[PDB]
């Protein structure tokens with residue numbers, strides 16, 4: 476029990492990074508001496524178990540999180556300040572995904588990698604016309620969409636259902652109000668239960684990543700050190716442009732001096748880089764906002780909300796990650812699929828999920844909507860590759876997420892003062 480206990484409190488992301496390094500080394504050593512059949516027969520089934528567990532948790536989270544999230548920012552309860560801050564959060568998230576897509580075009584990640592896990596390349600599906608893509612957002616049967624794997628139709632039904640519940644809770648009838656509260660509590664309980672299961676699965680992630688990487692390297696000796704460096708460079712350069720080309724421009728437009736803003740907010744960014752948690756730095760963010768002179772009534776509402784639904788760093792990462800996987804498999808993304816990435820990433824941020832390791836679940840949502848199933852051996856291999864280096868990228872993502880929260884509060888405060 477002592478050895479098992481020591482395995483738990485070790486950070487999950489660092490454990491996943493360790494599994495990636497040893498998996499590559501073990502696969503190369505075994506493959507040089509043969510033993511490719513042994514790795515395929517025995518090591519591979521452990522990796523297949525991990526992806527099956529990860530895919531099982533996707534659909535219940537999609538429905539439950541969006542229903543609860545949409546109820547919190549429903550128009551029935553949003554004030555004048557709430558409306559303005561919500562618009563800013565959604566617009567900035569939309570441009571973050573687009574910026575990440577552009578960076579993936581300049582630096583091609585995984586272009587040199589050619590993945591044939593089973594001996595055959597990935598076969599993409601046919602692209603429907605653009606007009607049909609827009610219409611299929613509305614599901615003809617909400618139960619059928621849940622039974623199947625339509626992510627976007629499920630999101631559409633969950634959002635409108637959550638908004639309608641909030642209007643029922645303002646009704647004059649006592650019975651109607653009680654029925655609405657009971658339904659919301661049951662759906663909220665389902666979301667909380669899913670997060671507990673996510674914590675357990677992520678503890679098995681280092682074992683699953685080790686098996687997937689070892690199987691790939693044993694069969695073929697692909698070089699990934701250079702390619703994983705390019706995806707790291709694309710993410711960090713994109714994060715820098717997000718601050719300079721968006722936050723600095725918006726502050727200049729609204730009259731806030733960008734130089735003074737950075738000096739006051741430097742404490743929040745450093746804490747975000749070290750702790751690598753948005754909720755952990757919330758007390759520090761509140762103190763920084765008070766120093767700038769923002770009224771207590773404003774930042775006491777915007778800052779707690781921003782830590783949940785405003786994530787510019789995560790949105791940019793999802794754009795780069797999707798192109799890396801598609802390039803590695805040799806497929807191409809059409810304009811209809813690229814717009815699906817932007818629409819899915821922005822809408823999924825509304826869902827209330829703060830459990831660590833939820834970034835992997837979010838990436839699986841985007842891949843499934845585009846048309847890259849996680850059960851495919853080629854997709855799973857590429858997915859485990861970029862998941863291994865998640866420890867390095869996490870520090871940069873958290874800093875941008877916190878910085879965007881402070882920028883929105885300052886802009887809203889200036890408008891209220893006028």
Ligand SMILES: N[C@H](C(=O)O)[C@H](OCc1ccccc1)C(=O)O
Pocket residue numbers: 751752753754786789828829830831832833834837869872873876
């Ligand atoms: N760590 C980041 C943060 O807390 O701001 C960020 O948060 C985790 C998260 C939670 C839910 C959905 C997406 C991402 C991440 O790691 O991707």
Ligand code: NA
Pocket residue numbers: 563564565566567568569785786787879
């Ligand atoms: Na945003």
Ligand code: NA
Pocket residue numbers: 753781782783785786787876877879880
């Ligand atoms: Na944030």
